[PDB]
């Protein structure tokens, strides 16, 4: 099925504190009132194109939606990223893994040929993520706080702050989610123009599009 994205998908573009300034930015964001391809993987994870960074979402507050696999060949020929969780912390590795048809993860591992990098870091709750790639820098944003504005739908306004920035420098055109052994939105990003209003403490409180309506 399909879903309409009301206002989700606005984040801090840079790392500059500001106060009470209406700032106009020209950066690739998620257009307002766009279409998102809701999936229903409950009693199914098809392959999706990357296309210069993707939105992501979920609504299940348990240990099922665990891993992200990225790459362009999904084989040991080309390095494949892997972001997983073991209930305490996060590993990021650009090492090479072989193909997995139905991998199972939750609290897959095929090969470790040419393993070069490693990194270790730390109404229900919906976890928003945005994945971006600019000139060899891979950025992952996150949000772990829900808003109960309306029931059964994620309507409201929220921002996103960067948490992981990686200077790896690889080109990715394919990604899949991972599950265990025994429901998430997806969107694309376009280079639009936005106008952002900063609160007195420097937090985004209101964003308005610049290429949607004559009033806008």
């Amino acid at each position: 099925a399909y879903t309409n994205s009301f206002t989700r998908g606005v984040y801090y573009p840079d790392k500059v504190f500001r106060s009470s300034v209406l700032h106009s930015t020209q950066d690739l964001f998620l257009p307002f009132f766009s279409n998102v391809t809701w999936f229903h993987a409950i009693h199914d994870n098809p392959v999706l194109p990357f296309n210069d960074g993707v939105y992501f979402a979920s609504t299940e507050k348990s240990n099922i939606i665990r891993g992200w696999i990225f790459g362009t060949t999904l084989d040991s020929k080309t390095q494949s990223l892997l972001i997983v969780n073991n209930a305490t912390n996060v590993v990021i590795k650009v090492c090479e893994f072989q193909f997995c048809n139905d991998p199972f993860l939750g609290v897959v591992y095929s090969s470790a040929n040419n393993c070069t990098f490693e990194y270790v870091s730390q109404f229900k709750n919906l976890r928003e993520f945005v994945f971006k790639n600019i000139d060899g820098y891979f950025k992952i944003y996150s949000k772990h706080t829900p808003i109960n504005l309306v029931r059964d739908l994620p309507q409201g306004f929220s921002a996103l702050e960067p948490l992981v920035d990686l200077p790896i420098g690889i080109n990715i055109t394919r990604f899949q989610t991972l599950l265990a052994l025994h429901a998430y939105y997806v969107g694309y990003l376009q280079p639009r123009t936005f106008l952002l209003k900063y609160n007195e403490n420097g937090t985004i409180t209101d964003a308005v599009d610049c290429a949607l309506d004559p009033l806008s």
Partner: protein, 419 residues
Amino acid sequence: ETKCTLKSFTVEKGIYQTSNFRVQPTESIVRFPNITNLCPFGEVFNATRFASVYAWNRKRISNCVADYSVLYNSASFSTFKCYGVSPTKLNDLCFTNVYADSFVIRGDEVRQIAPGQTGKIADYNYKLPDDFTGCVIAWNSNNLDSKVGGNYNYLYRLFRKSNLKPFERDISTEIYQAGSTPCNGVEGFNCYFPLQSYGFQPTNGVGYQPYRVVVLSFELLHAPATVCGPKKSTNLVKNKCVNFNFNGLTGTGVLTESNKKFLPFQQFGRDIADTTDAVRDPQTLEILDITPCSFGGVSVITPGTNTSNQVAVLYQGVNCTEVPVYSTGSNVFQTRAGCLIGAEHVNNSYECDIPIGAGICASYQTSQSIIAYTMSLGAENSVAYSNNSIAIPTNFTISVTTEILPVSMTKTSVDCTMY
């Protein structure tokens, strides 16, 4: 200064602008991230064993912050000479990655490691490409290799007519028999092992003592910088005009304590037009404010060279406590428009002669000195208005007044091509 600016030998009564003053800076400060990940170079140079010259060891190193100055001053090396790159500047360069090549050679083969050279190991064991390499480091190893080293554990390759390309290892152990016409016209004979052993003895000389050698090749501008040299830091000062870095954002100003609250992920704030206003340093993680250093133009008030030869100096819009003859000077008079020096102050008030600003002006008019006072709008009087009183004039005088109005100016033309 007034005569220079006006370009004349006579001046008239009034106020003039000569130049502007700007507070000079002081010692600079530099700050940088608190911790640096040390690159594990101890396992490279202090390694247990180095392989043979024909099977030398590789290593790829990146994402390091390693100091090379702490290694250059070390005297435990037989030779440390670098090509095309000044070692003293290695702390001011960033590279994509670095490749380390480790082996052990003989004493007299040191000259064989150089671009555009001829030799056995130079062309047949390890060929340095006809371009810049990082550099070679060699040190004596007779303590660990010529005394307790293996008798034939170190080998070279006596294989010729197969000049190796740069960065090429041929570890394929194949007996060298051509098996064709150009070897005694026989097949199977003239078979010589491609490898051979170094001949070393305890205190055998200089050209036969095995030396540990590491060749470093740095890849530059091939990718975003990953490895960089460490940079030193220093302390900070307050309430002084200083030029500062703060992790890259150089600027001049005066440091103050700020009450602003940063979110845990910003780096430095601003207000408008990229003008930085607050910065936070990594070592203390404390937010602080930046204020531009004071400056401004100066002015001279003079009564005219014809009358006298004394002036009063006015500094515009500066707290006159720190102006630095005119460092202490005469009675400093701080007003709303800066401070005036060289003239006295009175509580009296007269007509204004040379306007200054903020409702005060200075002249010598109501002994032989300039006085600055608060201008008076005129005289003062009151009229006894009453509801049954009138005043009717009885005499009259006729007067004449003059008014001057321009109506035209000179008509000029300018040729274009000629000019």
